[PDB]
Subunit: 116 residues, 4 copies
């Protein structure tokens, strides 16, 4: 089952953050960021199916959550351009990665839930 | 389906917070706190089945999460006695309440996800 | 020289949370919450001068931050009644405590900074 | 008089996060990240003196907080490589920015306090 999931919540409305664009990148050997996967959060604030076990190999990944566009669509002026979560994915440890983000106009928190 | 759910995460280990005691109270007419429901978080960090739609009427509720005992069992010295979430439950609005808590030894955050 | 300080920030506006009422209680020998100190946050979101080292003895304290009133004055209907921070203080000799809170309408986080 | 300040707290120890490396970048006209300023947090968890009002012109800035190195020195293997805070600055005239970060091994939150 999916090894990388993203969950986004809205701390102003107390709801999933719906239709949030999410872009994932993998760090290339020349230290640049290579597009890897993308999607939009669902009505439950979740984004599944970004990648597969076969392709999600060890390496450094960046998950960019397009928070600015989200707040603009709600008519709220935000601080950040996006929320960026940068981490190393590794094999000897819990398999499923869930990247959770809690959004406010001038603040955000992000948490990783790593389980098998 | 269940109108009050609790989800607890551990920000040190990146995992659900398992076997965390949770006590819910309702505010009585004499302004005291009346025991209402309790349980222990599951292996997924979740506590379901605390109450039913029929009994969960409008009023002020307190959800106490016994964080101190959780950290002590992990051998970590914590700051808080517990995390307390106090809110009014109301009928004209999203039906399902999810009280989420993210735990660290000297900090915690709590968020409400209200949906129907 | 202030042993107990409270700092509150607004995650919607990216500013200190001004004029937030704060009530402090201490658990008495008969297990009730006795009023200990109160005040309001300043223009900087800070509340100083609640107590003195002499009066701030060992005990279990509860810091109640009146978030609901804060949001109502901004025209926002928030989820929580207040943020409650409960902790044992000075059980290993005197310490200085800063209780920080970050507020959003449906979420808040609280951290403690403890120094000798 | 400092227009850009960084404050970092440790949610495990309940203390300022000391000696945390911070790198600031500004997006150049060719869309690359140009080095802008860097430093390390003090005993109070604060980093001041990164720039001057004159040099801190309008632009998109990225504040990279080197959290992984911080946790490794404490013997903790954390999830994130660093915390990245990306924002447009001074697009409506000069402002003063405080970028605050609260760190846990598998979680972090960042807030901005912006004043005129
Ligand atoms: O049960 C749910 O819907 C929430 C599951 O994911 N949320 C995680 C989370 C919640 C609150 C935080 O301050 C940080 C992370
Ligand atoms: O006591 C101290 O050292 C200063 C307290 O300032 N707290 C700032 C803060 C606290 C929690 C956050 O999630 C973001 C910023």
């Amino acid at each position: 089952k999916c090894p990388l999931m993203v969950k986004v919540l809205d701390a102003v409305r107390g709801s999933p953050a719906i239709n949030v664009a999410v872009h994932v990148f993998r760090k290339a050997a020349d230290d640049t960021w290579e597009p890897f996967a993308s999607g939009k959060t669902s009505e439950s604030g979740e984004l599944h199916g970004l990648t597969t076990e076969e392709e999600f190999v060890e390496g450094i990944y960046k998950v960019e959550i397009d928070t600015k566009s989200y707040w603009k669509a709600l008519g709220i002026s935000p601080f950040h351009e996006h929320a960026e979560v940068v981490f190393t994915a590794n094999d000897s440890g819990p398999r499923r990665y869930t990247i959770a983000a809690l959004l406010s106009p001038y603040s955000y928190s992000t948490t990783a839930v790593v389980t098998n």
